[PDB]
RNA sequence: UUGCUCAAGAGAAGUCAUUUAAUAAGGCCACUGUUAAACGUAGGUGAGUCGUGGCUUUAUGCC
């Protein structure tokens, strides 16, 4: 049967500074829009935390098609072709070329 | 003085009276703009009115 696992995890308290917008003059402001209420609140972009999330499963040993290097900061492709049957990455992140 | 010399085709008259291009018609039925992504790191400003009034020590600042 088809099952899903849907979560809203909250964050501890603490300064953030992510994800910055477009880094316009001197200044390097957050990304911020409006939310309930019609106040602004600070946003952090879901691809930041997919990439953490990518690197976690690349630093725990899994096998992952991407790689990264953490010292030139590229990101490699193990393998060209992309085989979500083998590569943790491509499983569930999903891929296109 | 020219086969010439002169020489009005002239006077008057409504193309009129009447007539629906009318009756009827669905541009209709179907369509995902699908799939993936670290913001890394450095780019600026245009425009009035004129002589103390409630607080506060003139002071000097609030409305």
Not at 12 to 17: D, E, M
Not at 25 to 49: C, D, E, M, P, R
């Amino acid at each position: 049967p088809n099952y899903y696992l849907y979560g809203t995890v909250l964050t501890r308290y603490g300064l953030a500074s992510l994800n910055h917008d477009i880094r316009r003059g001197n200044k390097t402001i957050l990304q911020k829009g409006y939310w309930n209420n019609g106040k602004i609140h600070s946003f952090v972009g879901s691809s930041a935390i997919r990439w953490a999330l990518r690197f976690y499963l690349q630093k725990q040993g899994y096998l992952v098609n991407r790689v990264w290097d953490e010292e030139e900061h590229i990101n490699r492709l193990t393998s060209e072709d992309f085989d979500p049957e083998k590569f943790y990455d491509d499983d569930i992140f999903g891929f296109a070329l």
